[PDB]
Protein: cAMP-dependent protein kinase catalytic subunit alpha
Organism: Cricetulus griseus
Amino acid sequence: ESVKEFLAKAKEEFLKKWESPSQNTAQLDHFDRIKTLGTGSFGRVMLVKHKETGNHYAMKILDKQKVVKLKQIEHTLNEKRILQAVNFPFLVKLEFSFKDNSNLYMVMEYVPGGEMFSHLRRIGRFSEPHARFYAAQIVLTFEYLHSLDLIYRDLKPENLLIDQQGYIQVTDFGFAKRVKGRTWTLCGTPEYLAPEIILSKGYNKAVDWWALGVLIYEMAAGYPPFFADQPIQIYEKIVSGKVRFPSHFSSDLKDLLRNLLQVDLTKRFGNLKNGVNDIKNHKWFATTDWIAIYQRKVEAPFIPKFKGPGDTSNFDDYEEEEIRVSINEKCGKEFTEF
Ligand SMILES: NC(=O)c1ccc(C(F)(F)F)cc1
């Protein structure tokens, strides 16, 4: 009943914000631009500082015209509407959003510890206790998101930031969607795609649990289970039903992974009648105190090294490009609700 009433309140609070989303809660000239932290085909993320409060934030800037060209309108609308409505210890918080003639802006908490991707590549692989600590946070986060009828659809090490306490904060809801039943969009990163996405089926929250299997494998081995030079070759391996495990994997880890990396979605852990409890009660998680993790009372495997809230040393270097705002409004109608 403890978990039931927690998720009931979580859904109540989500739905209230979902039905009446916040809009236009800051503007660009409230901030100073510090550094570009990441950059993609239709957007980038910049470290900014609020000029009145002095607080740092990570500002995600999406070019409206590129979003339209790359067919991400609904996706960017999803991202902001979901982010302004959710609330969970392991999700990066949205602080402000707004738009102008050219761009959409999402101003979120800055997490100076960097991406799990960087730390995993630096150290090679995480021990199983270390992987398990991160994995438990993803399990709780998906339990929360799925109870809200949300699918995340972009789990990968680059999207998991490590905060000042060594805990996970999930960033980038660009593919997140509220889904009752099934959904159909081809999206994600090739290494993490579930078989039913590759095969163009109507799919559901089970694709997140598949991706957790990929993530756990990659954290514990140092490389993902399905690897190749071309995506087509990655896809052949994903749909094949075959996965090889390093000998150093524990038997418990291999057993959990076989049940998360189950190509038949109707037999995949997290998509059975017991839902998330098949994962939470698995022997590989026997040492996990789920409440202590939620409450952030467990000592973390490591604390990122950084000097303060404005330190960018854990992120990498990108060409610094203008934030140009056109004199004329672009795509006003498409992004009315933003
Ligand atoms: N919320 C953050 O602190 C954050 C930092 C960096 C990125 C990156 F995508 F650019 F890497 C995204 C988000």
About this structure: Residues 21-114+306-338 form one domain.
